[PDB]
Amino acid sequence: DPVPTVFFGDSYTANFGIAPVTNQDSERGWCFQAKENYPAVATRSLADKGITLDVQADVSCGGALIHHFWEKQELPFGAGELPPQQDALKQDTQLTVGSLGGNTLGFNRILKQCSDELRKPSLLPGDPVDGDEPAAKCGEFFGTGDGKQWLDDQFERVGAELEELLDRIGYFAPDAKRVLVGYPRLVPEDTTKCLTAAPGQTQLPFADIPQDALPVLDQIQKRLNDAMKKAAADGGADFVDLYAGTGANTACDGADRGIGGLLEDSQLELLGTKIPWYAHPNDKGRDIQAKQVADKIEEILN
């Protein structure tokens, strides 16, 4: 029996960094949506456990905030405006899976606050939060500065928008089982490990990001995690908690790392150049995400 499914999401569902991209030569080429994102792979695995998903749409796109779920997405450089992701849903849709939230919290703007490197032209959206506060002051600004109230501001835009997302889904796809996917762990509980470059890498997991900045970063990810979990709890959604089991597949677990480094090179090439991972899941990181998602879907369809 087909299970009409829609995948939606930010670049942790699109899988920024894995190539080939789908819609290469089109407007959605700027979504940097791999052909083999966790959605594509979970389908495959579920097919062979005899679960047959009839994917109706996969509208994940990098840079997508939560509100792009109901607002038009403006792609970079004049590419075009993408329709709201909610438009991909049908009343006969039975399953919705994706990750939304990191961009609204602005996890991208947080890396650029702690990295001068990142504050230069890169393909990672956003501006630093305080463009004048300096890169290294970063673990301080967020823990003590104006960054501390700013986090709480954003955290509250997050609850409200997750809550709204979970209700437009409930409205549009009344029968849909809703699955909210969590972000996998970036930084381990033992930051010391980020201090070494990963086998084959010359550059550190998190480039110029003050090491002292590392524990705040996790703290920020724990929160975000906890916000998404209450959102699904209170919304009637199921949540896939990747953060709780990627504890040893972080940016800094060397060869078991599931996160490509900040400045490490993806598979993506633009003129004769690899675009860096920018801290997005890699092949392994995508295999986990793929596994974990397959796993819960199985749970819920049984």
How far from chain centre, in Å, is Cα 214? 19
26's tokens: 């089109």
Q: Which amino acid is at 139?
A: G
| DSSP structure string for 44-106 | HHHHHTT--EEEEEE---TT--GGGGTS-EE-GGG--EEPPGGGG--TT--EEEE---HHHHT
- Partners of 3 in the beta sheet? 53
Q: How was this structure determined?
A: X-ray
**Nearest Cα to 286, choosing from 73, 10, 83, 39?**
39
- Identify whether 280 is a catalytic site residue: yes
The dihedrals phi and psi of 104, each to the nearest 5 degrees, come to -75, -35
Q: Which residue, 299, 259, 214, is CA-closest to 17?
A: 259
Given the residues 9, 17, 62, 63, select the one marked as catalytic: 63
Given 9, 11, 98, 101, which residue is catalytic? 11
Active site residue 67: no
CA-to-CA distance for 229 and 96, rounded, in angstroms? 16
Angle at the Cα of 290 (from 288 to 159), degrees rounded to 5? 90
CA 261 – CA 253 distance, rounded (Å): 11
Domain boundary assignment for the chain: 1-302
SS3 call for 126: coil
Does domain 1-302 correspond to CATH entry 3.40.50.1110?
yes
| Alpha helices, H only, the chain | 11-14, 38-48, 102-105, 107-113, 138-141, 147-172, 214-235, 283-300
Torsion sign, CA atoms 27, 32, 244, 225: negative
Question: Rounded to whole angstroms, how far apart are CA atoms 215 and 260?
Answer: 19
3-state secondary structure of 265: strand
Among the listed residues 37, 60, 103, 115, the single catalytic one is 103
Active site (annotated) includes residue 68: no
